[PDB]
């Protein structure tokens, strides 16, 4: 449908290919790090609603709406959850964000990584509360992870990077497109890194350029984790990734990656749906949240 | 600001004026009644999201979004709540829907009646869980109430109507504008009944904004309506609301408070996009409002 890939999810080329093709400005490191903030005497998070006027290239103005969530102690409060609960990805299980969220008393929960809509298979790298759920085998998509010592990681990782046991990843999830790198829009570089020069680069561009519902995760200079969500509907309402990156750039976000969007985009506040999903409740025309894969959860305990 | 009245809330004329000026087709009765459904073997409610394309008279298209909530046993599950809890109106108290809702474990809660934004005074008639909270003194605004035997009441009521003790109101709340009467748009009649002959009321009707409404369908189920918006920028005007509910087979409905007051709270969590700002920031914030319309367990 609105997926970035037509055959298999992710590029076929290696991490060294990604490294050699990135701009000299970033040296030879294909990721960014930031020590997580440690505000253990603060509330867990801040949930912010925005309704903003967006201008597209044609000059027409549109209203968009969504949430920005700030997490003050990411190491202790952020979890990557399998659909429905532990073991969900092994069963190709799909489940609403709310249902999965209620397994951990999540204060805020958003849909997470990409999945195969036909088979329900989880995609990308997945580490959930210290447990390796899925090793993609070094597939080069944008990554977000939290290491055991509190380091936030954004960008492109090798299979060796994610399997390290010195300072192991305790949370890891994959998206598609690295939106911001070091406070700069990184979409053009992401297209080079995350699409196959061979198999249908056009469909990947349409995924970037079309407006839709979108979600993203990033961080600011203070080490706070930033969750982004904008409601929309592919080719009808919402934002394209250029607009998402600019919006986050103006929110002082340093690094951010794009997570699953379209009808998957869901914002759940303390177990209740608090967004407007795009899918229909067939055969009726009411709107319904989608059964999705992994979930990004922010919990109190 | 976007209030329907510039001086005092409500028209200056009596219920006798409303009766004398209403259309001949409706006789001398200025309200509608409907036995509430009592589906005790159904879920308490069904809350559905809509995102729809609306066209106005000028032909321009806009997207609107909100919720429709159906209540299967209104008598046992619907409550009109005072801001913050019992006694809130006596103190001119204003409070978030979310805060007021947690005093009754509301599954769904929306902002309720109109209030004075400067003093915080509650407006209209208010009966909360069998308790008479406010007697407006016969002010002729659109009313919604539930009587003890399960009768749903919509429309214009006299002071004698609300003080009756034979089959007394257990819930009662006032809005502004009777949107639908007997399945027909009733906005022109509402302007006649609820405004003084002495433009500002018309603008309140015609401008687009966030809106909320309560009504019922042929089955006696109660319908809660909410559409997000911002006065003169996004949302719907009352003509569009009446048509939207009319196409959902709503028989009678009244317009409740809108604008920045419009709030939809799902299981204690804010689940809409309010228009007010979190001053001095540009984020959006729910407003501290007055009475709340609450849907709770039986
Ligand atoms: O998440 P999206 O972009 O809305 O795509 C989801 C869509 O995929 C295809 O186009 C169809 O199967 C649609 O029925 C479905 O709604
Ligand atoms: O609920 P509304 O329609 O957005 O109006 C609220 C606003 O009305 C006017 O613009 C002003 O008087 C504001 O002080 C007020 O906050
Ligand atoms: C615009 C957008 O992000 N659409 C996504 C699609 O790309 C993805 O493949 C699918 C399943 O993960 O969910 C959504 O439809
Ligand atoms: C468009 C609309 O419903 N605006 C209302 C206004 O009429 C009302 O007076 C005020 C307080 O009750 O709340 C909102 O601003
Ligand atoms: C990305 O490349 C496009 C070419 O499609 C160009 O027009 C645009 O200016 C570039 N944007 C950035 C942020 O480099
Ligand atoms: C979350 O919701 C549950 C019931 O839905 C409630 O008991 C709990 O207090 C809520 N938590 C917060 C932080 O509001
Ligand atoms: C409202 O009233 C005016 C004049 O009385 C009339 O022209 C208009 O068509 C009416 N509209 C509706 C919907 O009744
Ligand atoms: C409200 O939450 C409780 C469980 O926490 C339950 O009654 C129901 O699932 C929820 N109701 C709605 C309408 O979401
Ligand atoms: Cl090499
Ligand atoms: Cl008179
Ligand atoms: Cl107007």
XYZ file of C-alpha atoms and ligand atoms in Angstrom:
720
model
C 0.000 0.000 0.000
C 1.950 2.959 1.370
C 4.964 0.832 2.294
C 8.453 2.013 1.349
C 9.461 -1.364 -0.146
C 7.789 -3.485 -2.813
C 9.615 -6.818 -2.350
C 11.602 -7.112 0.909
C 11.830 -4.643 3.772
C 15.087 -2.719 3.816
C 18.060 -2.358 1.498
C 20.231 -5.281 0.472
C 23.533 -3.448 0.938
C 25.825 -3.595 3.938
C 26.694 -1.241 6.758
C 30.065 -0.550 5.122
C 28.203 0.560 2.001
C 26.181 2.926 4.190
C 29.343 4.177 5.903
C 31.287 4.755 2.680
C 28.437 6.699 1.072
C 27.657 9.049 3.973
C 29.003 12.624 3.910
C 32.570 13.230 5.092
C 31.089 15.707 7.571
C 30.157 12.779 9.834
C 33.498 10.964 9.659
C 33.271 7.168 9.663
C 30.635 6.796 12.407
C 27.121 6.114 11.106
C 25.245 6.792 14.362
C 24.776 9.477 17.007
C 24.824 9.085 20.784
C 23.501 11.154 23.680
C 23.498 10.366 27.387
C 19.906 10.087 28.549
C 18.630 12.603 31.058
C 18.258 11.289 34.605
C 15.414 13.358 36.080
C 14.411 10.714 38.610
C 12.693 13.264 40.889
C 10.464 14.615 38.091
C 7.215 13.323 36.599
C 7.786 10.537 34.089
C 6.743 12.517 31.026
C 5.117 15.607 29.534
C 2.369 15.144 26.932
C 1.870 18.118 24.624
C -0.891 18.620 22.064
C -0.222 20.673 18.945
C -2.534 21.953 16.221
C -0.375 23.715 13.645
C -0.604 25.365 10.241
C 1.648 23.640 7.689
C 2.584 25.004 4.258
C 3.500 22.678 1.387
C 5.570 23.362 -1.727
C 2.516 24.473 -3.729
C 1.890 27.183 -1.116
C -1.407 25.799 0.192
C -1.898 25.820 3.964
C -3.225 22.869 5.959
C -3.984 22.143 9.604
C -2.279 19.193 11.297
C -2.675 17.851 14.816
C -0.759 15.510 17.059
C 1.313 15.070 20.179
C 4.861 15.727 21.329
C 5.878 13.658 24.357
C 8.977 14.457 26.425
C 10.463 11.697 28.590
C 12.572 12.881 31.519
C 14.242 9.580 32.550
C 14.289 7.438 29.389
C 16.438 4.560 30.668
C 13.943 3.707 33.421
C 10.646 4.497 31.692
C 10.973 3.568 27.993
C 10.302 0.026 26.788
C 9.927 -1.637 23.404
C 7.003 -4.061 23.654
C 6.126 -7.040 21.488
C 2.585 -7.149 20.065
C 0.250 -8.503 22.727
C 3.106 -9.262 25.107
C 6.341 -11.248 25.260
C 6.574 -13.795 22.466
C 4.226 -11.874 20.186
C 6.719 -11.415 17.354
C 7.492 -15.146 17.259
C 3.788 -15.727 16.493
C 3.540 -12.976 13.843
C 0.941 -11.486 16.168
C -0.743 -8.134 15.558
C -2.546 -6.210 18.275
C -3.917 -2.760 18.991
C -1.499 -0.370 20.691
C -3.935 -0.003 23.645
C -4.196 -3.734 24.254
C -0.431 -4.170 24.226
C -0.061 -1.010 26.312
C -2.303 -2.386 29.060
C 0.195 -5.206 29.656
C 2.634 -2.704 31.219
C 0.505 0.178 32.584
C 1.935 2.516 29.957
C 1.254 6.198 30.609
C 1.894 6.927 26.922
C 2.119 4.370 24.128
C 2.624 4.759 20.395
C 2.841 2.242 17.591
C 6.401 1.145 16.973
C 8.211 -0.514 14.111
C 7.180 -1.625 10.653
C 5.620 -5.007 9.965
C 4.433 -7.154 7.079
C 0.731 -6.406 6.641
C 0.067 -9.753 4.948
C 1.948 -12.135 7.261
C 2.141 -10.024 10.424
C 5.889 -10.591 10.653
C 7.911 -8.160 12.751
C 10.625 -6.268 10.869
C 13.974 -4.725 11.721
C 15.955 -5.169 14.907
C 14.017 -5.583 18.155
C 15.382 -5.691 21.707
C 12.680 -5.575 24.384
C 13.655 -4.978 28.023
C 17.059 -6.556 27.519
C 15.788 -9.491 25.436
C 16.869 -9.935 21.818
C 13.564 -10.432 19.999
C 14.706 -10.050 16.387
C 18.124 -9.736 14.759
C 17.584 -8.456 11.220
C 21.066 -9.582 10.175
C 22.487 -6.102 9.688
C 19.652 -4.661 7.598
C 20.387 -0.956 7.164
C 17.334 0.939 8.324
C 17.252 3.821 10.774
C 17.609 2.604 14.357
C 16.769 3.862 17.834
C 18.135 2.096 20.887
C 18.948 2.548 24.549
C 22.113 0.994 25.942
C 22.363 -0.335 29.480
C 24.381 2.663 30.722
C 21.695 5.116 29.550
C 23.163 5.994 26.149
C 20.575 6.904 23.523
C 21.575 5.719 20.038
C 20.171 6.920 16.721
C 21.169 5.982 13.194
C 22.643 3.066 11.276
C 24.008 0.071 13.167
C 25.820 -3.057 12.089
C 24.854 -6.506 13.322
C 28.002 -6.442 15.455
C 26.903 -3.111 16.946
C 23.610 -4.500 18.238
C 25.096 -7.779 19.519
C 27.701 -6.070 21.717
C 27.670 -7.329 25.306
C 30.100 -4.792 26.799
C 27.369 -2.123 27.129
C 24.409 -3.985 25.670
C 21.272 -2.531 24.168
C 18.318 -2.874 26.524
C 15.817 -1.379 24.048
C 16.104 -1.345 20.265
C 13.657 -0.703 17.433
C 13.976 0.006 13.709
C 12.182 2.559 11.564
C 12.554 3.835 7.996
C 14.341 7.161 7.288
C 16.714 9.071 9.573
C 14.901 12.404 9.792
C 17.361 14.579 11.727
C 21.083 14.071 12.264
C 22.887 16.569 14.496
C 20.004 19.010 14.159
C 20.000 18.864 10.348
C 17.542 17.243 7.967
C 19.024 13.905 6.893
C 16.330 12.569 4.569
C 18.380 12.833 1.370
C 21.197 10.858 2.980
C 18.642 8.384 4.386
C 17.248 7.709 0.910
C 20.754 6.789 -0.237
C 21.286 4.535 2.777
C 17.893 2.846 3.169
C 16.714 2.204 -0.399
C 18.091 -0.242 -2.953
C 19.587 1.498 -5.979
C 18.122 -1.458 -7.906
C 14.571 -2.380 -6.848
C 12.058 0.446 -7.304
C 13.523 3.566 -5.749
C 10.416 5.409 -6.964
C 8.114 3.781 -4.415
C 10.510 4.778 -1.631
C 10.407 8.421 -2.764
C 6.601 8.406 -2.782
C 6.711 7.099 0.792
C 8.849 10.124 1.689
C 6.916 12.763 -0.264
C 3.286 11.774 0.369
C 1.455 13.280 3.328
C 0.117 10.817 5.888
C -0.059 10.078 9.577
C 3.464 9.847 10.968
C 5.280 8.926 14.154
C 8.886 9.512 15.159
C 11.266 9.201 18.091
C 14.183 11.488 18.858
C 16.038 13.337 21.578
C 17.037 16.864 22.524
C 20.362 18.225 23.749
C 19.352 17.600 27.366
C 19.017 13.848 26.771
C 15.239 13.823 26.973
C 13.542 11.365 24.658
C 11.040 12.973 22.287
C 8.069 11.056 20.892
C 6.270 12.575 17.910
C 2.860 11.753 16.479
C 0.776 13.532 13.837
C -2.621 12.331 12.680
C -3.318 12.043 8.984
C -4.329 9.844 6.087
C -2.088 8.876 3.182
C -2.473 11.419 0.350
C -5.262 13.258 2.206
C -4.147 14.642 5.578
C -1.017 14.848 7.674
C 2.625 15.457 6.826
C 5.362 14.120 4.616
C 8.769 13.370 6.095
C 10.233 16.690 4.940
C 7.585 18.467 7.013
C 8.053 16.102 9.959
C 11.795 16.752 9.986
C 11.326 20.521 9.805
C 8.686 20.433 12.547
C 11.019 18.470 14.834
C 13.986 20.660 13.885
C 12.033 23.676 15.178
C 11.369 21.775 18.438
C 15.117 21.597 19.224
C 15.336 17.896 18.363
C 18.920 16.796 17.704
C 18.420 13.311 16.221
C 15.196 11.568 15.211
C 14.101 8.595 13.130
C 10.771 7.940 11.432
C 8.703 5.070 12.813
C 5.555 3.494 11.361
C 2.881 5.817 10.014
C -0.294 5.705 7.985
C -3.118 3.785 9.605
C -0.637 2.316 12.087
C -0.123 5.707 13.752
C -1.730 5.590 17.201
C -1.387 7.665 20.375
C -2.628 5.996 23.567
C -2.786 7.965 26.821
C -2.847 5.780 29.945
C -4.556 2.982 28.018
C -7.105 5.131 26.145
C -7.030 6.077 22.472
C -6.223 9.791 22.267
C -5.674 10.223 18.508
C -7.783 9.952 15.335
C -6.732 6.862 13.339
C -7.212 6.734 9.583
C -8.380 3.133 9.033
C -12.110 2.492 8.752
C -14.080 0.023 10.873
C -15.171 -2.016 7.872
C -17.899 -2.166 6.768
C -18.776 1.044 8.623
C -17.089 4.384 7.993
C -16.171 5.089 11.606
C -12.427 5.170 12.285
C -10.545 2.340 13.966
C -7.066 1.878 15.420
C -4.993 -0.699 13.586
C -3.656 -3.976 14.930
C 0.077 -3.303 14.740
C 3.367 -4.898 15.785
C 5.831 -3.564 18.352
C 4.831 -0.731 20.662
C 6.864 2.115 22.129
C 5.779 2.384 25.770
C 6.473 4.948 28.503
C 5.538 3.548 31.905
C 5.573 4.841 35.468
C 7.102 1.815 37.213
C -15.816 36.394 22.980
C -17.732 33.735 21.048
C -20.696 33.776 23.432
C -24.227 33.967 22.035
C -25.175 36.820 24.403
C -23.445 40.142 25.009
C -25.141 41.264 28.237
C -26.932 38.519 30.178
C -27.257 34.844 29.308
C -30.545 33.915 27.659
C -33.504 35.700 26.096
C -35.532 38.235 28.043
C -38.927 36.723 27.213
C -40.884 34.032 29.009
C -41.914 30.483 28.158
C -45.303 31.885 27.135
C -43.530 33.784 24.352
C -41.807 30.592 23.198
C -45.167 28.829 22.963
C -46.922 31.698 21.199
C -44.187 32.044 18.570
C -43.383 28.408 17.815
C -44.554 26.862 14.529
C -48.191 25.816 14.321
C -47.119 22.296 13.353
C -45.931 21.616 16.921
C -49.100 22.760 18.676
C -48.655 24.271 22.114
C -46.051 21.841 23.493
C -42.539 23.292 23.440
C -40.617 20.088 24.197
C -40.240 16.525 22.933
C -40.188 13.326 24.983
C -38.815 9.853 24.330
C -38.662 6.739 26.478
C -34.999 5.930 27.027
C -33.708 2.540 25.969
C -32.782 0.229 28.848
C -30.549 -2.364 27.180
C -29.155 -3.857 30.382
C -27.651 -6.734 28.349
C -25.543 -4.397 26.173
C -22.293 -2.555 26.900
C -22.789 0.762 28.655
C -21.863 2.734 25.538
C -20.203 2.701 22.125
C -17.756 5.512 21.335
C -16.911 6.045 17.663
C -14.530 8.422 15.904
C -15.479 10.201 12.685
C -13.260 12.147 10.290
C -15.451 13.729 7.625
C -15.279 16.169 4.732
C -17.711 19.062 5.237
C -18.827 21.497 2.534
C -20.164 24.951 3.404
C -22.388 27.209 1.306
C -19.421 28.870 -0.418
C -18.349 25.438 -1.708
C -15.066 25.154 0.206
C -14.229 21.744 1.683
C -12.848 21.159 5.180
C -11.949 18.148 7.307
C -13.574 17.753 10.722
C -13.025 15.109 13.383
C -14.719 14.097 16.595
C -16.681 11.468 18.457
C -20.201 10.067 18.519
C -21.089 8.226 21.738
C -24.191 6.025 21.974
C -25.590 5.254 25.433
C -27.816 2.194 25.758
C -29.257 2.841 29.264
C -29.249 6.611 29.830
C -31.284 6.559 33.048
C -28.731 4.458 34.951
C -25.500 5.592 33.248
C -25.854 9.331 32.449
C -25.085 12.029 35.023
C -24.855 15.818 35.029
C -21.918 16.704 37.286
C -21.041 19.953 39.020
C -17.532 21.330 38.413
C -15.123 19.598 40.768
C -17.929 17.781 42.559
C -21.113 18.530 44.488
C -21.267 22.163 45.539
C -19.075 23.346 42.675
C -21.674 25.665 41.153
C -22.372 27.408 44.471
C -18.693 28.439 44.533
C -18.599 29.557 40.871
C -15.965 26.864 40.457
C -14.387 25.990 37.116
C -12.554 22.717 36.564
C -11.247 20.494 33.795
C -13.619 17.844 32.459
C -10.953 15.272 33.295
C -10.793 16.292 36.961
C -14.565 16.425 37.436
C -14.971 13.123 35.589
C -12.800 11.158 38.023
C -15.226 11.910 40.862
C -17.679 9.508 39.174
C -15.406 7.100 37.245
C -16.850 8.344 33.966
C -16.207 6.068 31.010
C -16.897 9.024 28.697
C -17.190 12.663 29.750
C -17.750 15.855 27.788
C -17.991 19.468 28.847
C -21.541 20.399 29.738
C -23.402 23.682 29.998
C -22.500 27.297 29.414
C -20.898 29.438 32.100
C -19.764 33.005 32.701
C -16.110 33.191 31.664
C -15.431 36.203 33.913
C -17.131 35.119 37.161
C -17.291 31.344 36.634
C -21.018 31.298 37.379
C -23.019 28.296 36.199
C -25.809 29.044 33.734
C -29.143 27.485 32.896
C -31.045 24.846 34.820
C -29.001 22.138 36.538
C -30.211 18.949 38.225
C -27.419 16.575 39.252
C -28.234 13.000 40.302
C -31.659 14.002 41.598
C -30.471 17.220 43.278
C -31.677 20.621 42.089
C -28.428 22.557 41.693
C -29.615 25.642 39.808
C -33.028 27.038 38.889
C -32.444 29.592 36.123
C -35.797 31.264 36.791
C -37.494 30.215 33.574
C -34.743 31.332 31.195
C -35.703 30.042 27.750
C -32.713 28.147 26.413
C -32.700 24.643 24.957
C -32.913 21.950 27.635
C -32.014 18.289 28.003
C -33.245 16.249 30.951
C -33.949 12.730 32.169
C -37.025 12.092 34.299
C -37.216 9.483 37.042
C -39.174 6.995 34.908
C -36.592 7.147 32.104
C -38.224 9.804 29.925
C -35.741 11.832 27.876
C -36.814 15.467 27.462
C -35.523 17.911 24.849
C -36.560 21.482 24.173
C -37.999 24.471 26.009
C -39.245 24.062 29.573
C -41.050 26.349 31.974
C -39.986 26.745 35.589
C -43.046 24.688 36.562
C -41.894 21.919 34.200
C -38.540 21.481 35.944
C -39.907 21.737 39.503
C -42.479 18.954 39.026
C -42.318 16.171 41.625
C -44.757 13.658 40.101
C -42.058 12.260 37.771
C -39.139 14.487 38.721
C -36.045 15.213 36.686
C -33.006 13.326 37.965
C -30.669 14.983 35.430
C -31.147 18.347 33.737
C -28.809 20.634 31.804
C -29.211 23.648 29.531
C -27.554 24.511 26.242
C -28.091 27.162 23.562
C -29.994 26.316 20.340
C -32.355 23.388 19.735
C -30.570 21.769 16.792
C -33.038 19.052 15.757
C -36.715 18.694 16.634
C -38.501 15.536 15.490
C -35.742 14.822 12.988
C -35.841 18.279 11.377
C -33.422 21.181 11.627
C -34.820 23.604 14.208
C -32.217 26.387 14.221
C -34.494 29.088 12.802
C -37.091 28.352 15.478
C -34.362 28.333 18.133
C -33.177 31.795 17.065
C -36.748 33.027 17.466
C -37.103 31.396 20.880
C -33.676 31.974 22.444
C -32.596 35.405 21.149
C -33.888 38.922 21.702
C -35.183 40.922 18.759
C -32.896 43.703 20.047
C -26.829 39.730 14.952
C -24.483 38.512 17.673
C -26.656 35.430 18.224
C -26.720 34.760 14.479
C -22.923 34.927 14.324
C -22.739 32.362 17.132
C -24.894 30.088 14.971
C -23.122 30.697 11.656
C -19.468 30.737 12.708
C -17.521 27.484 12.616
C -16.026 26.282 15.894
C -15.646 23.274 18.132
C -19.113 22.029 19.056
C -20.773 19.481 21.321
C -24.342 18.234 21.418
C -26.612 15.714 23.095
C -29.555 14.000 21.460
C -31.334 10.701 21.009
C -32.317 8.309 18.215
C -35.573 6.487 17.484
C -34.548 3.622 19.792
C -34.223 5.906 22.797
C -30.437 5.655 22.936
C -28.671 8.826 24.027
C -26.215 10.357 21.559
C -23.254 12.485 22.633
C -21.630 14.499 19.853
C -18.292 16.286 19.793
C -16.356 17.928 16.966
C -12.985 19.575 17.482
C -12.454 23.031 16.068
C -11.535 26.628 16.742
C -13.854 29.612 16.410
C -13.650 31.068 12.882
C -10.830 28.687 11.916
C -11.829 25.025 12.171
C -14.859 22.941 13.042
C -18.558 23.273 12.236
C -21.375 25.765 12.550
C -24.718 24.726 13.992
C -26.342 24.255 10.576
C -23.613 21.733 9.759
C -23.914 20.048 13.164
C -27.683 19.683 12.788
C -27.312 18.168 9.318
C -24.528 15.840 10.485
C -26.636 14.520 13.372
C -29.722 14.420 11.156
C -27.919 12.023 8.804
C -27.114 9.857 11.845
C -30.877 9.488 12.469
C -30.914 11.783 15.501
C -34.484 12.812 16.354
C -33.908 15.559 18.937
C -30.658 17.248 19.906
C -29.546 20.418 21.642
C -26.289 22.334 21.306
C -24.107 22.374 24.414
C -20.998 24.451 25.084
C -18.409 24.626 22.308
C -15.325 26.587 21.394
C -12.406 26.073 23.751
C -14.759 24.415 26.228
C -15.249 21.423 23.909
C -13.562 18.448 25.575
C -13.817 14.674 25.137
C -12.441 12.546 27.980
C -12.172 8.785 27.492
C -11.708 6.741 30.665
C -10.196 9.697 32.467
C -7.809 10.594 29.629
C -8.050 13.604 27.344
C -8.866 12.176 23.906
C -9.585 15.306 21.831
C -7.648 18.328 20.533
C -8.791 21.429 22.445
C -8.332 24.876 20.963
C -7.130 26.919 23.954
C -3.381 27.424 24.342
C -1.238 26.599 27.383
C -0.346 30.248 27.860
C 2.326 31.465 27.320
C 3.228 28.429 25.165
C 1.597 27.434 21.866
C 0.642 23.901 22.913
C -3.081 23.162 23.250
C -4.764 22.838 26.645
C -8.185 21.757 27.907
C -10.247 24.512 29.468
C -11.504 24.745 33.035
C -15.262 24.539 32.474
C -18.458 24.222 34.513
C -20.888 21.292 34.503
C -19.925 17.989 32.883
C -22.002 15.386 31.041
C -20.791 12.012 32.322
C -21.398 8.424 31.199
C -20.577 5.915 33.943
C -21.271 2.299 34.835
C -24.855 1.369 35.682
O -1.677 2.965 6.209
P -2.233 3.420 4.869
O -1.257 4.331 4.174
O -3.533 4.167 5.061
O -2.433 2.090 3.959
C -3.407 1.152 4.309
C -4.182 0.878 3.052
O -3.422 -0.064 2.213
C -4.136 -0.241 0.901
O -4.148 0.949 0.257
C -5.571 -0.717 1.103
O -5.539 -2.097 1.554
C -6.336 0.098 2.093
O -7.570 -0.588 2.411
C -5.573 0.336 3.368
O -6.283 1.285 4.173
O -13.867 29.479 23.103
P -13.439 30.474 22.033
O -14.516 30.620 20.995
O -12.175 29.965 21.359
O -13.252 31.944 22.703
C -12.339 32.173 23.739
C -11.671 33.494 23.450
O -12.656 34.428 22.874
C -12.010 35.740 22.498
O -11.237 35.555 21.403
C -11.164 36.348 23.617
O -12.040 37.084 24.516
C -10.355 35.371 24.411
O -9.980 35.983 25.667
C -11.074 34.085 24.719
O -10.139 33.158 25.277
C 2.802 6.133 5.494
C 3.202 4.930 6.338
O 4.074 4.988 7.206
N 2.519 3.781 6.056
C 2.768 2.530 6.767
C 3.479 1.579 5.806
O 4.609 2.257 5.275
C 3.854 0.302 6.548
O 4.525 -0.531 5.613
C 2.574 -0.345 7.110
C 2.864 -1.557 7.998
O 3.978 -1.350 8.888
O 1.871 0.585 7.944
C 1.510 1.829 7.340
O 0.558 1.655 6.312
C -18.556 28.754 20.014
C -18.850 28.471 21.482
O -19.621 27.586 21.848
N -18.198 29.279 22.366
C -18.368 29.145 23.809
C -19.070 30.397 24.325
O -20.280 30.553 23.593
C -19.333 30.252 25.817
O -19.957 31.464 26.224
C -18.009 29.989 26.549
C -18.220 29.667 28.027
O -19.451 28.959 28.242
O -17.362 28.839 25.996
C -17.060 28.928 24.605
O -16.175 29.985 24.331
C 17.181 16.969 -0.897
O 17.275 16.673 -2.286
C 16.241 17.317 -3.035
C 16.211 16.693 -4.405
O 15.021 15.935 -4.589
C 16.531 18.809 -3.036
O 15.577 19.482 -3.848
C 16.466 19.315 -1.602
O 16.874 20.679 -1.556
C 17.362 18.495 -0.665
N 17.060 18.827 0.721
C 17.975 18.870 1.696
C 17.461 19.224 3.062
O 19.162 18.641 1.486
C -4.998 5.351 34.225
O -6.325 4.811 34.064
C -6.770 3.972 35.142
C -8.153 3.490 34.764
O -8.371 3.574 33.361
C -6.748 4.748 36.458
O -7.104 3.879 37.530
C -5.365 5.339 36.700
O -5.374 6.140 37.876
C -4.935 6.184 35.503
N -3.603 6.729 35.715
C -3.323 8.033 35.613
C -1.898 8.421 35.872
O -4.180 8.865 35.322
C -34.589 30.332 7.983
O -35.466 31.493 7.900
C -35.301 32.344 6.753
C -36.351 33.426 6.873
O -37.328 33.101 7.854
C -35.437 31.535 5.466
O -35.163 32.375 4.351
C -34.477 30.354 5.486
O -34.646 29.572 4.310
C -34.734 29.495 6.721
N -33.841 28.347 6.742
C -34.173 27.179 7.301
C -33.138 26.097 7.225
O -35.259 27.003 7.848
C -12.405 2.015 30.077
O -11.382 1.385 30.729
C -11.807 0.229 31.453
C -10.566 -0.612 31.671
O -9.484 0.184 32.141
C -12.928 -0.520 30.732
O -14.159 -0.207 31.382
C -13.052 -0.239 29.234
O -12.154 -1.077 28.513
C -12.782 1.220 28.861
N -13.936 1.801 28.192
C -13.850 2.464 27.033
C -15.138 3.002 26.484
O -12.778 2.622 26.453
Cl 35.751 -2.698 2.715
Cl -44.097 37.683 27.254
Cl -19.417 33.667 9.686
